[PDB]
Amino acid sequence: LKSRVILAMDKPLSYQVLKEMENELYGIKVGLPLVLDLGVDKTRELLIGLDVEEIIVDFKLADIGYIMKSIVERLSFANSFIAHSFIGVKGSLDELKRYLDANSKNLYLVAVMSHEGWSTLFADYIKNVIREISPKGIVVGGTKLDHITQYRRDFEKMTIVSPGMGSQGGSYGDAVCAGADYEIIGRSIYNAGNPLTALRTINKIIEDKVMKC
Amino acid sequence: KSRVILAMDKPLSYQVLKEMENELYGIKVGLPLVLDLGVDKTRELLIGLDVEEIIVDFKLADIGYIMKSIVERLSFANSFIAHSFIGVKGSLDELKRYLDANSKNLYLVAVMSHEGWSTLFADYIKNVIREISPKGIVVGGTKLDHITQYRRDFEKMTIVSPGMGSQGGSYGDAVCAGADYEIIGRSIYNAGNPLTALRTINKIIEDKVMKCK
Ligand SMILES: O=c1cc(O)n([C@@H]2O[C@H](COP(=O)(O)O)[C@@H](O)[C@H]2O)c(=O)[nH]1
Ligand SMILES: O=c1cc(O)n([C@@H]2O[C@H](COP(=O)(O)O)[C@@H](O)[C@H]2O)c(=O)[nH]1
């Protein structure tokens, strides 16, 4: 089958390794630590040499609209961007969404985070923001499986991406089983002795889990 | 003495900054700047400057591991801004610990300046701030009543307030409402003569402060 993995590239991997990974990943999530290390120019060059379904730039955008737009205009190599939902619509997400739509870029909104300290106190407000903005997708922690299932019910056509797998405790495939489309995986791949073997192993586990699912 | 923190969200010349250094409290480094110049040239530009405080503002809003990875790359700065919404355990707690270990200041975004910022989480945010006990907080200068309220609630905290000029805030009103410093971007860096703009703004702030004091 086809991979459900989005590589969280928060640290550089060699072109050699990434080249082999191309056809065994759904996408790559480009993180701020990576871009700070390589610079925008070299980040773009790196990705140009790669062929994956989706390149997602994730700077966890959470500012006024002007600043979020200023950031994304500098990163045209991405297909999609991640922003927070909690910042709200007027003068923040509305401006960003307008710009991204005008430039044929996708938006993902952070709905529920993976760490224990995240509050789900404001799900009604968060859902309204999401419903209002109408992003391509949302981020829902793979450590919060019940939230994944809840969000999939409340948003049937939404792309759901789920991080917190491996390092943070999520067992590979549980998020997809609970309703996510893709699982975001960072350290368990890029810090592995052999990141390629790590990816191939994970793809197997996910395949197995989904079937028992 | 200046109460202005220059929001450097686009490059300005070393030439100009050197004249500005003695007429500013501090400089807030924005993400578009660092994307443009790269980290190493950002370092070079700013360490070569003499201001009281350099605050790196990438609106930190991730898990602890990632937020720490980000700030470790910009440790020349004195202070960092993070969102309070993301919560404590596994996020802000790890960041605060790391920042403390390195004698860095943390500012938490408490109330944002745009219209879409919800008052719904006011109590939750206050709790996070009490739990973390950061050096300062960010409270929108377009939200003067919130500044005053937050000043009463956290009399010992540094309050910095953006939204002055471009977003409609009148220079000095934020300080008069009880903020220590005002954050100002476009009104200065997009001015025909940024130096003149800053001097004009400093004059306006001084006049206002002398009246509200
Ligand atoms: O709630 C969230 C949202 C995220 O985007 N992420 C991101 O998912 C990735 C997880 O990386 P790791 O597999 O090494 O735990 C990181 O890029 C992180 O910023 C997360 O961990 N939790
Ligand atoms: O609620 C907030 C919080 C901010 O940090 N800011 C920051 O304050 C600055 C405002 O710049 P400007 O004066 O050009 O509006 C920007 O760096 C922005 O990211 C804000 O505008 N509103």
CB atoms within 10 A of CB B49: 15
C-alpha to C-alpha distance for B175 and B211, rounded to whole angstroms: 11
Q: Is B186 annotated as a binding residue?
A: yes
Q: Which residues contact B44 (CB under 8 A, 6 or more apart)?
A: none
Main-chain dihedrals φ then ψ at residue A39, nearest 5 degrees? 85, 160
C-alpha to C-alpha distance for A203 and A206, rounded to whole angstroms: 5
CATH 3.40.720.10 is the classification of domain B1-213 = no
User: Residue A113: its chain B contacts at CB < 8 A?
Assistant: 63, 86-87, 91
Q: Are B162 and B140 in contact (CB under 8 A)?
A: yes
Within B129-203, strands assigned E span 136-139, 158-161, 181-184
Q: Are B24 and B33 in contact (CB under 8 A)?
A: no
Q: How far is the CA of B20 from the centre of ligand 1 (A)?
A: 39
Q: Are B56 and A19 in contact (CB under 8 A)?
A: no
C-alpha to C-alpha distance for B86 and B197, rounded to whole angstroms: 36
Closest by Cα among B2, B11, B50, B52 to B29 = B11
Ligand 2 close to Cβ of residue B185 (< 6 A) = yes
Q: Which residues contact B41 (CB under 8 A, 6 or more apart)?
A: none
Q: How far is the CA of A124 from the centre of ligand 1 (A)?
A: 23
Q: Which amino acid is at A178?
A: A
C-alpha to C-alpha distance for B158 and B178, rounded to whole angstroms: 10
Helix (H, G, I), strand (E, B) or coil at A108: strand
CA atoms lying within 13 Å on the CB side of residue B45: 22
How far apart are the CA of B188 and the nearest CA of chain A, in angstroms? 16
Resolution (A): 1.8
A63 is catalytic: yes
C-alpha to C-alpha distance for B45 and B29, rounded to whole angstroms: 11
- Which bin fits A3, alpha (ψ -120 to 50), beta or left (φ > 0)? beta
Inter-chain CB proximity A32 and B70 less than 8 Å: yes
Q: Which residues contact A173 (CB under 8 A, 6 or more apart)?
A: A183, A205, A206, A207, A208, A209, A210, A213
The DSSP secondary-structure symbol of B164 reads B
Question: CA distances (Å), A148 to each of A60, A137, A139, B50, in order?
Answer: 19, 12, 9, 49
Inter-chain CB proximity A86 and B91 less than 8 Å: no
Q: Are A162 and A170 in contact (CB under 8 A)?
A: yes
Q: How far is the CA of B15 from the centre of ligand 2 (A)?
A: 24
Structural method: X-ray
Q: Are B62 and A117 in contact (CB under 8 A)?
A: no
B109 DSSP β-pair partners:
B83, B138
Q: Which residues contact A167 (CB under 8 A, 6 or more apart)?
A: A186, A187, A188
- Kindly compute the dihedral angle of the four CA atoms of residues A153, A155, A156, A157, in this order, to the nearest 10 degrees: -170
Closest by Cα among A21, A7, A26 to A181 = A26
